[PDB]
Write a protein that binds this DNA or RNA. Structure first.
Ligand SMILES: [K+]
Ligand SMILES: [Mg+2]
Ligand SMILES: [Mg+2]
Ligand SMILES: [Mg+2]
Ligand SMILES: [Mg+2]
Ligand SMILES: [Mg+2]
Ligand SMILES: [Mg+2]
Ligand SMILES: [Mg+2]
Ligand SMILES: [Mg+2]
Ligand SMILES: [Mg+2]
Ligand SMILES: [Mg+2]
Ligand SMILES: [Mg+2]
Ligand SMILES: [Mg+2]
Ligand SMILES: [Mg+2]
Ligand SMILES: [Mg+2]
Ligand SMILES: [Mg+2]
Ligand SMILES: [Mg+2]
Ligand SMILES: [Mg+2]
Ligand SMILES: [Mg+2]
Ligand SMILES: [Mg+2]
Ligand SMILES: [Mg+2]
Ligand SMILES: [Mg+2]
Ligand SMILES: [Mg+2]
Ligand SMILES: [Mg+2]
Ligand SMILES: [Mg+2]
Ligand SMILES: [Mg+2]
Ligand SMILES: [Mg+2]
Ligand SMILES: [Mg+2]
Ligand SMILES: [Mg+2]
Ligand SMILES: [Mg+2]
Ligand SMILES: [Mg+2]
Ligand SMILES: [Mg+2]
Ligand SMILES: [Mg+2]
Ligand SMILES: [Mg+2]
Ligand SMILES: [Mg+2]
Ligand SMILES: [Mg+2]
Ligand SMILES: [Mg+2]
Ligand SMILES: [Mg+2]
Ligand SMILES: [Mg+2]
Ligand SMILES: [Mg+2]
Ligand SMILES: [Mg+2]
Ligand SMILES: [Mg+2]
Ligand SMILES: [Mg+2]
Ligand SMILES: [Mg+2]
Ligand SMILES: [Mg+2]
Ligand SMILES: [Mg+2]
Ligand SMILES: [Mg+2]
Ligand SMILES: [Mg+2]
Ligand SMILES: [Mg+2]
Ligand SMILES: [Mg+2]
Ligand SMILES: [Mg+2]
Ligand SMILES: [Mg+2]
Lengths: 177, 115, 79, 66
RNA sequence: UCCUCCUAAAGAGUAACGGAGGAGCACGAAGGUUGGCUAAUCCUGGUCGGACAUCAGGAGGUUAGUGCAAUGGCAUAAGCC
RNA sequence: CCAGGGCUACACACGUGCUACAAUGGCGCAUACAAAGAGAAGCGACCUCGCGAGAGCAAGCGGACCUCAUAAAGUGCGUCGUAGUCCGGAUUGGAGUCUGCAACUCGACUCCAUGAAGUCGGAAUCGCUAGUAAUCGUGGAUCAGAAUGCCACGGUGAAUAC
RNA sequence: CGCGGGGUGGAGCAGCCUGGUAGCUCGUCGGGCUCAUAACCCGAAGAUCGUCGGUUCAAAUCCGGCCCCCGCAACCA
């Protein structure tokens, strides 16, 4: 709730002056943070996905959905309705709580973090980070995990352009290159 | 047991614990523990948290981990861009310090190949 | 590397460079002194170092300073 | 949210060596200890110190000095 | 022997050693019914992750899907949970 | 006659070595025992500067005196506890030192970081019958500089030979 | 023209008519052994399966055409 109230108390204002918005609803707001973890190696070992889910459930608050394979493909030897990855679609209250914990204490533990890519936008304000390790989040014990399976964070917003959506994140002291 | 970029050892003496940092060897590690005012015989489990924060500022003096990796990667990439004898040596995957390249050179050249 | 008592260049190459730099840019200098280091004043000159059988032109840049001239003229050709 | 199935999402106090005390809510346990934060990380100075590393001509002048 | 398309001349039917394909089962849920859903192919962006696994968006508008051939059908979906 | 370059190239194959793969071992501190040889544009103390290669000032000695020269394995305490490890120390980046007209092709050594292959080796196969094999250091010749080679020297010191 | 069967490391054979797996024996290259060669011993590579298309999540293996190849038939007047 801290970043949530920060948005309303500050930021709501800061963005109004930049793009001379007519109304307060025109300002981009952050909709959902979708944590994906396409484990993939679960074809060989079935438990390996259950280990990844335990890690996502630790990293986020809520428990992840086990995503099925959409179509069968020969390139990786998978079939229709096979559990291939994990996801969490966290939004609302716990979203802002996670979003604080991400930027404020998780990003800084990225190995040799110099600057995050400002050109990593979808052409519609929706940002996508990809973390290499789990260890960067302080929820994982060091002697528990035995495999470097990263996730990828995807911040979805209401902006109609990446330039409009950059300022939104940048206004939360987001480390860009 | 979380200083610099990585350093997470346990059941290991302090001097040998800090060798696990990239950019810190055996002699460098003794200079850290001398300046910090910590005995080399103790281990990180035995140490307290008040002492570990003094090690964090001490290793911050020296260039370590990704600061170092980039400094090395810059210097090698510099040579290759010049097109000097060392640069040609680097990109070709052959030994640089005027070494024998006929019989041995297996570390730089890699394992054996067919003809 | 060797030599703390003055970075080394041949008398003939120093006087040829000082004469070339004061006049202005012209052409590749035929030089056989590979051993000789590179000074800051040499930057801009396209001096031609002897590889063994011919002279290889080398446009001197900001980086090519601490290095020696023979480093930019491979002697043995391979493949 | 669906109760029972999720893990215990309890409040905890983050306290780094810098001095920034900070309450948060996460699935850890009792307390936390951090190295760095959004404040106190060298990215604002890091990029200043990292980019201005090159310099070959002055390095030569520092050896010869004449 | 059986089913689908044409030949078949805009009702039905209509031959040839005419032209093309299928079937001899499957299923206790792949039936019933209430409640919800909506698809291919892209283009972007994204940890390994590649031409293609998973996520996020957009553009698309049924180009899909329908236990099995084809034809006729299917959004109120007969498709998907 | 001369400047460079080359003899040091490198998909690969073999020969001869060295260093390994560790715990009878690795790294630190306490400190004991050799033999032989060398030296005048030589060998170069005590010093004093240096983290260290070394650098200045210079003692003595053409030597049973002076110097290179603390031999190292070896004890004695410590600490790591079988890990690609505090094993290995390759390979590279940076910073240097000496020699030398000159060290990039192409030297040696030093410091710092780096920390590869390698967990005892397929078919084969080699030397060795006692101060020998094994293993530790040591010196000299050629030599401005440049040994893991060569030629010598001594430490500890086995097994086995029906 | 009809009808079965074929076409896979350099050679000859399996794996092919039950869709996801490429073996065997020689030969070749490397190292041993020998005075040397052979024999012998120890390692290593070498085929996207006739070709062009389908079907399929995926084809050496299913189906269709086309190019060689064997075997069988082209009979009564
Ligand atoms: K009729
Ligand atoms: Mg280290
Ligand atoms: Mg070292
Ligand atoms: Mg050499
Ligand atoms: Mg040529
Ligand atoms: Mg009709
Ligand atoms: Mg009709
Ligand atoms: Mg009619
Ligand atoms: Mg009729
Ligand atoms: Mg039929
Ligand atoms: Mg039936
Ligand atoms: Mg049911
Ligand atoms: Mg029904
Ligand atoms: Mg539209
Ligand atoms: Mg359809
Ligand atoms: Mg159809
Ligand atoms: Mg139904
Ligand atoms: Mg339906
Ligand atoms: Mg020779
Ligand atoms: Mg060479
Ligand atoms: Mg040599
Ligand atoms: Mg040996
Ligand atoms: Mg050793
Ligand atoms: Mg030892
Ligand atoms: Mg060691
Ligand atoms: Mg050591
Ligand atoms: Mg003395
Ligand atoms: Mg002395
Ligand atoms: Mg003094
Ligand atoms: Mg001293
Ligand atoms: Mg000296
Ligand atoms: Mg000295
Ligand atoms: Mg004498
Ligand atoms: Mg003496
Ligand atoms: Mg000596
Ligand atoms: Mg003596
Ligand atoms: Mg163990
Ligand atoms: Mg390794
Ligand atoms: Mg180690
Ligand atoms: Mg290995
Ligand atoms: Mg191994
Ligand atoms: Mg042995
Ligand atoms: Mg045998
Ligand atoms: Mg030894
Ligand atoms: Mg010796
Ligand atoms: Mg001598
Ligand atoms: Mg020796
Ligand atoms: Mg085979
Ligand atoms: Mg052979
Ligand atoms: Mg062929
Ligand atoms: Mg299909
Ligand atoms: Mg196949």
């Amino acid at each position: 709730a801290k970043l949530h109230d920060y948005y309303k108390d500050e930021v709501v204002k800061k963005l109004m002056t930049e793009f001379n918005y007519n109304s307060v609803m025109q300002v981009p707001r952050v909709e959902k943070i979708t944590l994906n973890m396409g484990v993939g190696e679960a074809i060989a070992d079935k438990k390996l996905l259950d280990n990844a889910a335990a890690d996502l459930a630790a990293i986020s608050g809520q428990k992840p959905l086990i995503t099925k394979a959409r179509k069968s493909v020969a390139g990786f030897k998978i079939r229709q309705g096979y559990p291939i990855g994990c996801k969490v679609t966290l939004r609302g209250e716990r979203m802002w709580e996670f979003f604080e914990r991400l930027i404020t204490i998780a990003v800084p533990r990225i190995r040799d973090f110099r600057g995050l890519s400002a050109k990593s936008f979808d052409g519609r304000g929706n940002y996508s980070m990809g973390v290499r390790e789990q260890i960067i989040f302080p929820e994982i014990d060091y002697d528990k995990v035995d495999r470097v399976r990263g996730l990828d964070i995807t911040i979805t917003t209401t902006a109609k352009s990446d330039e409009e959506g950059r300022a939104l994140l940048a206004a939360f002291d987001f480390p860009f290159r | 047991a979380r200083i610099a970029g990585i350093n997470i050892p346990d059941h290991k003496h302090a001097v040998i614990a800090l060798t696990s940092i990239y950019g810190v060897g055996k002699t460098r590690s003794k200079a850290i523990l001398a300046a910090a005012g910590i005995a080399e015989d103790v281990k990180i489990s035995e140490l307290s948290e008040g002492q570990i924060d003094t090690l964090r500022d001490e290793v911050a003096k020296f260039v370590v981990e990704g600061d170092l990796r980039r400094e090395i990667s810059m210097s090698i990439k510099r040579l290759m861009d010049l097109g000097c004898y060392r640069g040609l040596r680097h990109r070709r995957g052959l030994p640089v310090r005027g070494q024998r390249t006929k019989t041995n050179a297996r570390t730089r050249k890699g394992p054996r190949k067919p003809i | 590397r060797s030599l703390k008592k003055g970075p080394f260049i041949d008398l003939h190459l120093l006087k040829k460079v000082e004469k070339a730099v004061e006049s202005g840019d012209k052409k590749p200098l035929r030089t056989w002194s590979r051993r000789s280091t590179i000074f800051p004043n040499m930057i801009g000159l396209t001096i031609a170092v002897h590889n063994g059988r011919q002279h290889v032109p080398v446009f001197v840049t900001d980086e090519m300073v601490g290095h020696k001239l023979g480093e930019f003229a491979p002697t043995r050709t391979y493949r | 949210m669906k109760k029972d199935i999720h893990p215990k999402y309890e409040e905890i106090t983050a306290s780094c060596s810098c001095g920034n005390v900070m309450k948060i809510r996460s699935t850890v346990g009792h307390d936390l200890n951090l190295d760095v934060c959004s404040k106190c990380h060298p990215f604002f100075t890091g990029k200043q110190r990292d980019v201005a590393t090159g310099g070959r001509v002055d390095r030569f002048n520092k050896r010869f000095n004449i």
